[PDB]
Structures are given as C-alpha cells and as structure tokens.
Amino acid sequence: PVEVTYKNMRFLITHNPTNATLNKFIEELKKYGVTTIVRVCEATYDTTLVEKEGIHVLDWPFGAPPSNQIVDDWLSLVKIKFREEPGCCIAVHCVAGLGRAPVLVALALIEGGMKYEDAVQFIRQKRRGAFNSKQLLYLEKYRPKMRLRF
C-alpha cells in the first residue's frame, strides 16, 4: 500500500482484498485511520463487515476518465471527511494492482494546489510505476475547479 499526504489530506492506495482476508484488511485500514474506501473498479467483496466497523464503502467505477459526477462526488468527499474527521485517511483501490486507483488521488492533489506534473511526481516517489500513457494525457487536460480551501 502506498500512502500520500498533502495539506489536511491523507490517502491510502491499497489492493483489492477478498472476503477471506477482510479481517486483516479492516485491521490495517483501522491502523491507518481510514474511515472511507472508494472502489473505482469492479466490486468483488462484501462490505457488511467493513461498514459495521465504521468504514464506509463507495462504489464509483470508471482508460475511460472519471465522469464529472464521480469527480464532483470525490472532491465533495475530500472536502468534508478531512474536515469533520481531522487526521483521517481515505483509501482507494482498483482490482489488479494500483491500476486506476491513483488517478483520483492525483485529482485531489491538483485541487490542493499542485499542477498535474507535480502530482504525478509526488505519487511516483511512492509508487514508481504509477500512471500509464493515457492517464498522463488525461491529467494533462484536466481543468481543476480550484475551490478547495486550506
């Protein structure tokens, strides 16, 4: 798992767990203080146990760039969580490796004040292979709202 922090934000880009390894998964998320999981790819495990531990799971599946709705919901989540729950962490994962999980994190960083190249370097310092060709071109044309206050 790679962890990235900037301003009042802290994200955990993790791997997709399985029903059989949910206890260890939850145990680790709790140690990282995560109270929210965003699944941006296929949903492959039951969330009842996760939700009961106070960890809310969000399924925003999205190659194809995140829809404007997903981006808006993501930015709304980043805004409120790190404010209402100081020092918390938001986890994000795909299905096979990092995948597209780091895309939303980069968006949060850009929204935080970084230009896309900075966000990409910032993530790669933690995960060398982060972002493929298509994703870089997408991040390059992303027009941030720049409405988050810090």
Curated annotation (Swiss-Prot):
It is a lipid-anchor. GO terms for cellular component: cytoplasm; cytoplasmic side of plasma membrane; early endosome; endoplasmic reticulum; nucleus; spindle. Its EC number is 3.1.3.48. Substrate binds at R100. It comes from the Eukaryota. Residues 87-122 are annotated as: Interaction with ATF5. Disulfide bonds join C41-C94. The active site is at C94. One of its GO terms (biological process) is positive regulation of cell migration. Induction: Strongly down-regulated upon tetrodotoxin treatment. Phosphate binds at V95, A96, G97, L98, G99, R100. Protein tyrosine phosphatase which stimulates progression from G1 into S phase during mitosis. May play a role in the development and maintenance of differentiating epithelial tissues. Enhances cell proliferation, cell motility and invasive activity, and promotes cancer metastasis. Homotrimer. Interacts with ATF5. Interacts with tubulin. This is Protein tyrosine phosphatase type IVA 1. It comes from Homo sapiens (Human). The gene is PTP4A1.
